[PDB]
Amino acid sequence: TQQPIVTGTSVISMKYDNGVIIAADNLGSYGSLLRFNGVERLIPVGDNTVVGISGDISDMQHIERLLKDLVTENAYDNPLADAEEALEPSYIFEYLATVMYQRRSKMNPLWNAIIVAGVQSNGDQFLRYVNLLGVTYSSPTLATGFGAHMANPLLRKVVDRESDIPKTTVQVAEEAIVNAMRVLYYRDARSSRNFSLAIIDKNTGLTFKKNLQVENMKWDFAKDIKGYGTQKI
Amino acid sequence: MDIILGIRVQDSVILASSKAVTRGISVLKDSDDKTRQLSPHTLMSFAGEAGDTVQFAEYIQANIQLYSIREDYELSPQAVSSFVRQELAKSIRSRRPYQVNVLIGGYDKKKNKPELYQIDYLGTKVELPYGAHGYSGFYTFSLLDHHYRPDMTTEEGLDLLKLCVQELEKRMPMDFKGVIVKIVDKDGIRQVDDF
Amino acid sequence: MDIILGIRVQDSVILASSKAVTRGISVLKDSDDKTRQLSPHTLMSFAGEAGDTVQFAEYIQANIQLYSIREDYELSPQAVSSFVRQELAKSIRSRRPYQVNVLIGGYDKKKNKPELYQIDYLGTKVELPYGAHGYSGFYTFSLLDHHYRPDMTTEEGLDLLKLCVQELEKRMPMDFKGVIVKIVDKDGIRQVDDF
Amino acid sequence: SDPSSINGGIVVAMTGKDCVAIACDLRLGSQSLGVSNKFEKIFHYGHVFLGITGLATDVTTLNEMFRYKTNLYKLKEERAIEPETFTQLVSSSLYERRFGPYFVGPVVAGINSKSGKPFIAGFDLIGCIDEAKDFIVSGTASDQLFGMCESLYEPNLEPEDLFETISQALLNAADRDALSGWGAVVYIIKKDEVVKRYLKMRQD
Amino acid sequence: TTIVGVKFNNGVVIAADTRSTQGPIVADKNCAKLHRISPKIWCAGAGTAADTEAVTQLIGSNIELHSLYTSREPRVVSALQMLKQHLFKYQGHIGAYLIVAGVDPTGSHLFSIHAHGSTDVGYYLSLGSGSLAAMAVLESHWKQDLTKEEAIKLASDAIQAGIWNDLGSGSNVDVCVMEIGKDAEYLRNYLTPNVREEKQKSYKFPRGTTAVLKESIVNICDIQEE
Amino acid sequence: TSIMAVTFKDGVILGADSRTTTGAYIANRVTDKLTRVHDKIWCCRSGSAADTQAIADIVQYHLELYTSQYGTPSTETAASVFKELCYENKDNLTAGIIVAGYDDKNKGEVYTIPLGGSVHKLPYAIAGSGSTFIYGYCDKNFRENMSKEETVDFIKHSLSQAIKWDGSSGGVIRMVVLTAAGVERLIFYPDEYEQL
Amino acid sequence: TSIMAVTFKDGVILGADSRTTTGAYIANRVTDKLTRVHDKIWCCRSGSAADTQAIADIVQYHLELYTSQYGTPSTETAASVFKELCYENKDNLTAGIIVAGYDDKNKGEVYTIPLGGSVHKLPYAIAGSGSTFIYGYCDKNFRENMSKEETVDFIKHSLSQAIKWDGSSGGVIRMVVLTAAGVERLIFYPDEYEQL
Amino acid sequence: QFNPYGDNGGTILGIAGEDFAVLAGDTRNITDYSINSRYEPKVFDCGDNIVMSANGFAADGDALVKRFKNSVKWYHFDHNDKKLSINSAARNIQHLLYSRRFFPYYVYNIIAGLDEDGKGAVYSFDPVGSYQREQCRAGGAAASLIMPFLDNQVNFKNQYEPGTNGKVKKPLKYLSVEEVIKLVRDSFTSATERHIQVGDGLEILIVTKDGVRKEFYELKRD
Amino acid sequence: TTTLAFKFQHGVIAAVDSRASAGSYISALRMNKVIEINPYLLGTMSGCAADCQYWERLLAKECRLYYLRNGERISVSAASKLLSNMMCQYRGMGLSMGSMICGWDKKGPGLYYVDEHGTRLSGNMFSTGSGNTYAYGVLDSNYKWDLSVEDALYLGKRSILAAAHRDAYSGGSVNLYHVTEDGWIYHGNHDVGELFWKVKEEEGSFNNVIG
Ligand SMILES: [Mg+2]
Ligand SMILES: [Mg+2]
Ligand SMILES: [Mg+2]
Ligand SMILES: [Mg+2]
């Protein structure tokens, strides 16, 4: 049993017609202190999977190394490591999900909430969640922490059920994700303006976007707000 | 001060109450009478926290005796029980409640009927053919449920009461030093001196 | 399983042990024998936490019976008591101690002397002319201090024991359902079937 | 310990066509011990019926309180109180003990003598009003009652059909509650006649 | 619970869901969370439901008396000030979390009030367990110079977000529109997107199914003449 | 919260962020923490919003009544009323207030009233959860008798850093300028102050 | 405690105060918190002195053994050994360490290892109880590729403020300069840095 | 402090017919007041004509189901591809559960299938391993809402025959699969109305001698 | 819960209720609280049903293995002791079990009470559960050794009824068992609701209850 120290907030994601999108801000908070501003919390595994992690950063760095070791180990005595026997999103997830549940079963968890996003060999979209308890679930939209409360409602307006996925384009999905990240910046006290976004498409592959910023913000209406009730000046 | 039983038969109410009083690990008394006469035809037995029981009982007694003198009239057992209930319901939300459970055995001279009321320290009142407080009912109610009739004589009620006490004496861990038995009927209140 | 008394008279040791066993608010048994014969001339009575008492007693019994067979010889009451003490002293610093108090009444055939040992669950051993565990001594020791002689007969010891039980029955809040009395002398161990 | 579940008991109320129904079990206990099988939890003040679950002493106390208040209401207003008005009185009376509440779950039932409109209402312990069209539940088996009522109930039932519906809702809910049962009473209420029926049920 | 408030061109609109819960159980599926303080001052309440009513009634009573005394129409700042001073006094023990909105001779106003007594001003607000779902919608679609129709749309869309996404919120959407120089229009069940589907079976019993022990007529009438 | 009040040549300027949090949720991102208790006596509030609002309202009432009887009160007098409330009710309050005001006689003055209810007159004062991160910056960059533009830049730069590091602080930077000329409100948005 | 490590053009400089407290008592006013784990790899220690000393000793042992087998280790490698100890034993440790070192290939590098056992490579790092007060100052005044004299002034000024505000920090300012030229120790006394 | 357990809500229901059996459960997964998924299957086909649902803490439920499916696999290997009877599966699961008596699988489990005589069967478990065969059993969040209804409409409890007035009970006539499915749907529709953790969708698995069949129905999404 | 068992002239009777509760909610109306260890041995169940089921089924294993090794049926005394010894291993770990072991062996009919504490008591009559006090009252006042099988069955049946009525956590149905030297004989499941009214009429008891 522990307590998280350096933490990473929401990770948000959704499925669209040809793939998945996932995003997460570049902040490593130390309680209320916004300590580290250059933290990458989206970690690609090969060219078909991106693992987004929230929660304890030291545990994230540990998981990051497990995945890096997983890639190395898969290549061992494997002539088809860059082909038919390459790592799949479902393999990577199930491995993590096994580790998370085992760690909680020893009462020494990895204090994280993880979302594995990717595209399978047959072109199917993969999006599934797992956390420190070893709890798993899948949905057209997934988000961790605050994203679960604020992002999902917005993303579910685009893809409310499974049948909406083919109707949703990458431009619409990316737009919804980017809007959600802006909302989280407005309302999550442990968020940052800077974030990373990754798209895994079954045609165009893995597009990893770094150094993104929340833009088109509304603040001007603040000038008119005065006092807390009766004050006019 | 834990065991108090009551049984309403044809023409009387019988109250049985233990004789033991314990302070610490020592039984101080084995002849304690856990009862007060509220009026000539109304008897109240009591059990609960030390001190509170007698103080409450005597306070009720004083109030009923005051009423009796003021109106030159004996209140019905029902009226007395309602007064007592209100006092306990009043007491439960006080700064320091009176932790007292009571049985009120009375003979209504107007209706010519015996009446037994069971009231706990919260002010929970119920009229019953037979009743008890604390764990007393756990041992005795199965026997009373089986043997009790509403047309029982006083002598049959006493025999059923003896069986209830014998079961208590067998299966209860605590020694309550037997019981004092009192009968409430049309002629008033009397004590069964051999039980 | 709370009351165990012992008294060493001229030519024998007498152990008196209550018959009650209580689970929750119900007395399950009123004929329980809280004793084990360790050897032909050594008897051990016991009291403490439920389960531990019998398990410990039987474990000791097995060990003494094993010794008896191996050496074709009966250990002295002193030797047995020392063995028992060590086991309890060992037990008190264990992960889960055995919460058991014992009295060991034995007749030493070599010295031709009765011997009573009192050992509590900590491994506190004392040889006494009379002993008890828990609160039993609080009621009985004043009588034993007054009436006890070392030249008492077995019959006088039993009479003094009856007085101790009567005082317990009067002033103890708990009903322990009387006692089983056993005598340990040169001829071995026997039970007094009327007490 | 939990005051709302020491004595046990349930009440349920339903609306029908030009009628209402209110029903209650008869049990009173001290946790595991059954004490009385004649502890009725429904009372009436004129043509307004009030069912009260929860701590028995408060049930008795509140009945005596509302008897007091409705008797004065009538002397001053020169008319019997109506269910809508009484509902507000119960709410008011409970909230005046906001920080020392009565541990109860009241249920009002009746028919407005002027409009003829059926009325039922439920409250929490500090008087929050739930004015439902369909049914109201209260007690230790409220979850069970919600489940029965939600499936058995249908609107605009006739008096003799409503009786069967409410009776079965109560009975089967009580048979899944350790602290409810030992008998049951049902009131069938119409604008100028009320029938009270005691039900036969298992006594365990 | 999910309640919101949205300012617009010539007034203000508030909205709320209709679900009331006791833990995970739904006590009432069509609760009324929009309360009237005065004709053109309405509030929506979250938190302890008996407290949101009690406090809204009390202040509404005193507001009405104040209006009669001063021969003036009540102001929102008056309700706001009376509410917060009452709530502050009880140090959060009165679990009332309110959004107060209305129009008065001064103009149109929108405030929020927390149980400890703190107040806030804004053009758009949300409160309750579904406030985060609602606020997400408000932050995505709110703009300056909204029209009455745009504001009602935004308001009800924000409540819907709570209905669907929050387990503590559900059933229907209530709305009240308070425009300047007009009567306030209370739109009970403005939206009804959660009607129960027809059941597969009728559970109407045959008459005589229930076992009966006794029957009797209950005398509800008074003591009769003659 | 991040708040500060700074005296300069022509008077005094109050500065504040606009974020109010309930845990990690931003309950209000456009809060006005610059509160008026008199024409040219304002305060910056930190701590329990309920407590600081209730205090400020009572103070405004006292100074309004003072003015009716004895004319315009001093900034010192205002600070004394704040202190009297905060000190006598310290067991039931969580309020960290900075009082700033302009007289013609005394000019710009700043008083800080921390948790205990003590009073401290200062050239400038900082407070709130985000003040911790700018103690060094503010100590190094403060000068007495700065110009209006210099003081605005100082507050803007300071709160910019407090916002940067403190998660409890953020939103816009509000400022209120108190001089002989009158009362001027200023506002600075994220795109302006973040790039400093 | 107040500690920091800053990279510059020619390499890296570690800086620290010298105060160790047991409550409000200063147990040691001349502590050396700048610890050597290898010739040109040093660390700054914060947290439990027992824990940080035990860790630093084990690390020094690992790097000494590493050097015997594989030659001079990298600063990254040193940080990894620190991390491995701090992460795997996080339940029983209270250590906040900054690792700084000089390679000829990589030049000056700084790694910070906070409580959890995470690692963060940075241009500069600050830590200790007194670091809180200089987040703003350090962010505003840091530049990349400073000269030795500029970097010494930056550290001196920064820790000066940390000491000024933090009661847990004080004494002298120790510094260690790591360059191709070698290892230079510096010290600055109160009369020097207090008047800054 | 770390709490290894959690509550993912959900409600399940198993009913045994004369020659069939059903195991139903909602598809909603939740934590606290948030929805995780509107469609996260909870009832599984484990093979050998057995269906299973572990309701409660999803992680332990997924682990138990995973283990049982594995126990079926190894039963085939070890015993010459013999079919695992429903009663044998039940006893096996008891031992899977009791292996964690001191750190249980926080789930109430149900399995359904056919016995060796071809009759419908449902077995119900508690978190620690006790089990027993039943005709009707609802488990999970809204179990208390549903079970009274089933006592009434399946076993005809408290229902007597008109005219006799409580002297003659309503006879226990067998129910058809279509009749059972109606009671299942009405059970979940009612539960959805009054329980916040129940909703989104209903998935039913029907077991007959012909095999396992699925049926899905929408539920309210509020 | 309510369970009892007693020895008599022609063997031992074992009677139990059928209710299971999760707080106030009745989770089970029909729960088998008797464990058919083997054709000559019965076990009651009190407390954790899991622990009762597991350990008593494990006892059955040991009793069967005993018979195979020794070619002779195990005694009730030995069987009861194997069980108590299993309990003593998880002494303090949190098991909850209260069971009477009923059987017939060489020494005649046998009855032993065994609880998680490792306690092991021989006796003619036992009763466990939240409603044991009610059951004891009926038993103590009507029990004889000279009882007929018919009367004895009724006694155990009636004693559970007494508990089912008064105890809130006892009820549902009554399961009867009669243990002979040729093995145990099941005497059916008896709904309490139906049994109550039946007994009330025939016996005249429960006068206070209206029917
Ligand atoms: Mg019962
Ligand atoms: Mg240490
Ligand atoms: Mg210092
Ligand atoms: Mg909802």
Domain CATH for B36: 3.60.20.10
Which residues of E participate in catalysis according to the annotation? 1
DSSP result, A115-161: EEEEE-TTS-EEEEEEETT--EE--SEEE-THHHHHHHHHHTTT--S
Q: Which residue has the tokens 């932050």?
A: E139
What is the amino acid identity at position D63? N
Nearest by CB to residue E117, choosing from F31, F54, F92, is F54
Cβ atoms of B87 and B104 closer than 8 Å: no
Measured from the Cβ of residue F101, the count of other Cβ atoms closer than 10 Å reads: 29
> Which residues are paired to F138 by β-bridges?
none
Q: Searching chain E, which residue's CA lies closest to the CA of residue F53? A: E118
What is the amino acid identity at position G27? A
Query: What is residue I199's three-state secondary structure?
Result: helix
Q: Do B175 and C174 lie within an 8 Å CB cutoff?
A: yes
Q: Is F11 left (phi over 0), alpha (psi -120 to 50) or beta?
A: left
**Whole-number Å distance between alpha carbons of H201 and D182:** 39
Q: Searching chain I, which residue's CA lies closest to the CA of residue E213? A: I211
Pairing of strands G34-38, G25-28: unpaired
Cβ atoms of A55 and A111 closer than 8 Å: yes
Cβ atoms of F17 and F172 closer than 8 Å: yes
For the domain spanning A1-233, the CATH number is 3.60.20.10
Q: What technique was this entry resolved by?
A: X-ray
**Whole-number Å distance between alpha carbons of H185 and H13:** 10
Closest by CA to F181, choosing from F37, F5, F3, F9, is F9
Residue H39: list chain A partners with CB under 8 A.
139, 161-162
**Whole-number Å distance between alpha carbons of E34 and C123:** 74
Numbers of helices and strands, H then E, in chain C? 4, 12
**Whole-number Å distance between alpha carbons of B143 and B136:** 12
- Closest ligand to the CA of H30: 4
Which residues of G participate in catalysis according to the annotation? 1
Query: What is residue I55's three-state secondary structure?
Result: helix
Cβ atoms of D17 and D161 closer than 8 Å: no
Any alpha helices (H) in chain H, and if so which ranges?
Answer: 58-78, 86-98, 143-153, 177-194
Question: Ligand 1 mean position to B150 CA, how many Å?
Answer: 24
Cβ atoms of I193 and I207 closer than 8 Å: no
Q: Do B22 and C172 lie within an 8 Å CB cutoff?
A: no
Work out whether the CA dihedral D104, D107, D108, D109 comes out positive or negative.
negative
Phi and psi at residue G141, to the nearest 5°: -105, -10
Query: What is residue H123's three-state secondary structure?
Result: strand
Please name the CATH architecture into which domain H1-222 falls.
4-Layer Sandwich (3.60)
**Whole-number Å distance between alpha carbons of E163 and E193:** 10
Q: Searching chain G, which residue's CA lies closest to the CA of residue A35? A: G135
Q: Do C51 and I132 lie within an 8 Å CB cutoff?
A: no
State how far the alpha carbon of F169 is from the alpha carbons of A30, A36, A221, A227, F26, in Å: 15, 16, 19, 18, 10
Nearest by CB to residue B138, choosing from D7, D33, D100, is D33
Domain boundaries, chain A: 1-233
* Chain center to CA of G126: 8
Question: Ligand 4 mean position to A160 CA, how many Å?
Answer: 14
**Whole-number Å distance between alpha carbons of C159 and C180:** 14
Element (H, E) at D163: helix D159-174
State the burial class of residue E159 (Cβ atoms within 10 Å of its Cβ: 0-12, 13-18, 19+). Answer: buried
**Whole-number Å distance between alpha carbons of C118 and C109:** 20
Q: Searching chain I, which residue's CA lies closest to the CA of residue D6? A: I24
Residue F23: list chain A partners with CB under 8 A.
189
Phi and psi at residue E66, to the nearest 5°: -70, -40
Name residues whose C-beta falls within 8 Å of residue G135's C-beta, 6 or more positions apart in sequence: F133, F134, F161, F165, G126
**Whole-number Å distance between alpha carbons of H149 and I37:** 35
Cβ atoms of I166 and B142 closer than 8 Å: yes
Closest by CA to B4, choosing from B157, B170, B176, B172, is B176
The per-residue b/e assignment along D188-201, b for 16 or more CB within 10 angstroms, e otherwise, is bbeeeebbbbbbbb
Q: Do D35 and B118 lie within an 8 Å CB cutoff?
A: yes
Cβ atoms of E162 and E137 closer than 8 Å: no
Work out whether the CA dihedral I75, I78, I80, I86 comes out positive or negative.
negative
Structure token digits, residue C165? 């039980």
Cβ atoms of A163 and H34 closer than 8 Å: no
Structure token digits, residue H105? 């699988």
Q: Is G106 left (phi over 0), alpha (psi -120 to 50) or beta?
A: alpha
What is the amino acid identity at position H74? W
Q: Is C51 left (phi over 0), alpha (psi -120 to 50) or beta?
A: left
| CATH number of domain containing D155 | 3.60.20.10
Any alpha helices (H) in chain B, and if so which ranges?
Answer: 52-71, 77-92, 136-147, 154-171
* Chain center to CA of C161: 13
Q: Do E194 and H220 lie within an 8 Å CB cutoff?
A: yes
Strands (E) located in C9-76: 12-18, 20-23, 26-30, 35-39, 42-48
Percent helix / strand / coil, chain B, rounded to 5: 35, 35, 30
Q: Do I54 and H126 lie within an 8 Å CB cutoff?
A: no
What is the amino acid identity at position H113? G
- Closest ligand to the CA of G17: 3
**Whole-number Å distance between alpha carbons of H168 and H57:** 44
Hey, what's the torsion of the CAs at H16, H18, H21, H26, to 10 degrees?
A: -50
Using a CB–CB cutoff of 8 Å, tell me whether F134 touches chain G. yes
> Which residues are paired to G138 by β-bridges?
none
Which residues of I participate in catalysis according to the annotation? 1
Please provide the distance, in angstroms rounded to a whole number, between the alpha carbons at the two ends of chain G. 20
Structure token digits, residue D114? 């002027």
Element (H, E) at C98: none
CATH number 3.60.20.10 given to E1-226: yes
Closest by CA to C100, choosing from C144, C64, C134, is C134
Measured from the Cβ of residue I186, the count of other Cβ atoms closer than 10 Å reads: 13
Total beta-carbon pairs less than 8 A apart between chain D and chain H? 53
Element (H, E) at H199: none
Cβ atoms of H89 and H111 closer than 8 Å: yes
Question: Ligand 4 mean position to E127 CA, how many Å?
Answer: 15
- Closest ligand to the CA of G50: 2
DSSP result, H76-119: HHHTTT----HHHHHHHHHHHHHTTTTS---EEEEEEEE-TTS-
Cβ atoms of E10 and H179 closer than 8 Å: no
Any alpha helices (H) in chain A, and if so which ranges?
Answer: 57-75, 89-105, 146-155, 170-187
The per-residue b/e assignment along E87-124, b for 16 or more CB within 10 angstroms, e otherwise, is bbebeeebbbbbbbbbbbeeebbbbbbbbbbbbbbbbb
Domain count, chain I: 1
Closest by CA to B118, choosing from B103, B130, B105, is B103
Domain count, chain B: 1
Q: Do D99 and E203 lie within an 8 Å CB cutoff?
A: no
A: neighbours with 3+ CB pairs under 8 Å?
E, F, G, H
Measured from the Cβ of residue F59, the count of other Cβ atoms closer than 10 Å reads: 24
Question: Ligand 1 mean position to H156 CA, how many Å?
Answer: 21
Element (H, E) at C6: strand C4-8
Q: Which residue has the tokens 């009571």?
A: B102
Contacts for C126-132: CB closer than 8 Å, 24+ residues apart: C127/C81, C128/C6, C128/C8, C129/C7, C129/C8, C130/C5, C130/C6, C130/C7, C130/C8, C131/C5, C131/C6, C131/C103, C132/C3, C132/C4, C132/C5, C132/C6, C132/C103
**Whole-number Å distance between alpha carbons of H216 and I125:** 55
Structure token digits, residue C183? 């005598």
In three-state form (DSSP H/G/I as H, E/B as E, the rest C), the secondary structure along A57-77 is HHHHHHHHHHHHHHHHHHHCC
Resolution for this experimental structure (Å): 2.9
**Whole-number Å distance between alpha carbons of E144 and H89:** 65
State the burial class of residue F154 (Cβ atoms within 10 Å of its Cβ: 0-12, 13-18, 19+). Answer: buried
Which domains does chain G possess?
A: 1-196 (3.60.20.10)
Measured from the Cβ of residue C188, the count of other Cβ atoms closer than 10 Å reads: 14
Structure token digits, residue C176? 């322990």
Using a CB–CB cutoff of 8 Å, tell me whether I205 touches chain B. yes
- Closest ligand to the CA of G92: 2
**Whole-number Å distance between alpha carbons of E112 and D119:** 35
State how far the alpha carbon of A121 is from the alpha carbons of A50, A127, A202, in Å: 15, 14, 9
Chosen for mutation from D32, D39, D144, D204 (greatest number of chain I CBs closer than 10 Å) is D204
**Whole-number Å distance between alpha carbons of H153 and H130:** 27
The per-residue b/e assignment along D6-40, b for 16 or more CB within 10 angstroms, e otherwise, is bbbbbbbbbbbeebbbbbbbbbbbbbbbbbbbbbb
| CATH number of domain containing I129 | 3.60.20.10
Q: Searching chain E, which residue's CA lies closest to the CA of residue D191? A: E220
Name residues whose C-beta falls within 8 Å of residue I163's C-beta, 6 or more positions apart in sequence: B142, I2, I17, I129, I131, I132, I133, I134, I135, I170
Element (H, E) at D190: strand D184-190
State how far the alpha carbon of D157 is from the alpha carbons of D16, D17, D18, D19, D153, in Å: 5, 5, 9, 9, 9
Q: How many CA atoms lie within 13 A of A64 on its CB side?
A: 17
CA angle H99, I1, B7 (to 5 degrees): 160
**Whole-number Å distance between alpha carbons of C77 and C58:** 17
Cβ atoms of C133 and C1 closer than 8 Å: no
**Whole-number Å distance between alpha carbons of I198 and I207:** 13
Cβ atoms of G55 and G97 closer than 8 Å: yes
Numbers of helices and strands, H then E, in chain E? 4, 13
Chosen for mutation from A178, A217, A223, A228 (greatest number of chain E CBs closer than 10 Å) is A228
Please provide the distance, in angstroms rounded to a whole number, between the alpha carbons at the two ends of chain B. 18
Residue A187: list chain F partners with CB under 8 A.
25-26, 29
State the burial class of residue A186 (Cβ atoms within 10 Å of its Cβ: 0-12, 13-18, 19+). Answer: buried
Domain boundaries, chain E: 1-226
Chosen for mutation from H11, H152, H219 (greatest number of chain D CBs closer than 10 Å) is H152
E210/chain D closest Cα distance in angstroms: 6
E20/chain H closest Cα distance in angstroms: 10
Closest by CA to C23, choosing from H97, I3, H71, A94, is I3
Question: Considering only CB atoms, which residues of chain E are within 8 Å of chain I?
Answer: 213-214
Q: Searching chain E, which residue's CA lies closest to the CA of residue I210? A: E213
Q: Do I166 and D33 lie within an 8 Å CB cutoff?
A: yes
**Whole-number Å distance between alpha carbons of C104 and C15:** 9
Name residues whose C-beta falls within 8 Å of residue I183's C-beta, 6 or more positions apart in sequence: I39, I40, I104
**Whole-number Å distance between alpha carbons of E89 and E70:** 26
Name residues whose C-beta falls within 8 Å of residue A192's C-beta, 6 or more positions apart in sequence: A25, A26, A27, A34, A37, A185
Query: Structural domain of residue B46, as residue ranges?
Result: 1-195
C27/chain B closest Cα distance in angstroms: 5
Closest by CA to A191, choosing from A5, A11, A3, A4, is A11
Using a CB–CB cutoff of 8 Å, tell me whether F54 touches chain E. yes
**Whole-number Å distance between alpha carbons of F189 and A218:** 10
Using a CB–CB cutoff of 8 Å, tell me whether H58 touches chain A. yes
Residue E213: list chain I partners with CB under 8 A.
210-211
Pairing of strands A11-16, A19-25: antiparallel
Q: Which of residues 91-130 of D touch B (CB under 8 A)?
A: 100
Using a CB–CB cutoff of 8 Å, tell me whether E117 touches chain A. no
**Whole-number Å distance between alpha carbons of G193 and I126:** 87
Q: Which of residues 136-155 of D touch E (CB under 8 A)?
A: 142-143, 146, 151-152, 154
State how far the alpha carbon of D168 is from the alpha carbons of A134, E208, E210, F8, H144, in Å: 43, 12, 7, 81, 16
Measured from the Cβ of residue I191, the count of other Cβ atoms closer than 10 Å reads: 17
Pairing of strands G20-22, D104-111: unpaired
Q: Do chains F and H touch (3 or more CB pairs under 8 A)?
A: no
**Whole-number Å distance between alpha carbons of I3 and I17:** 6
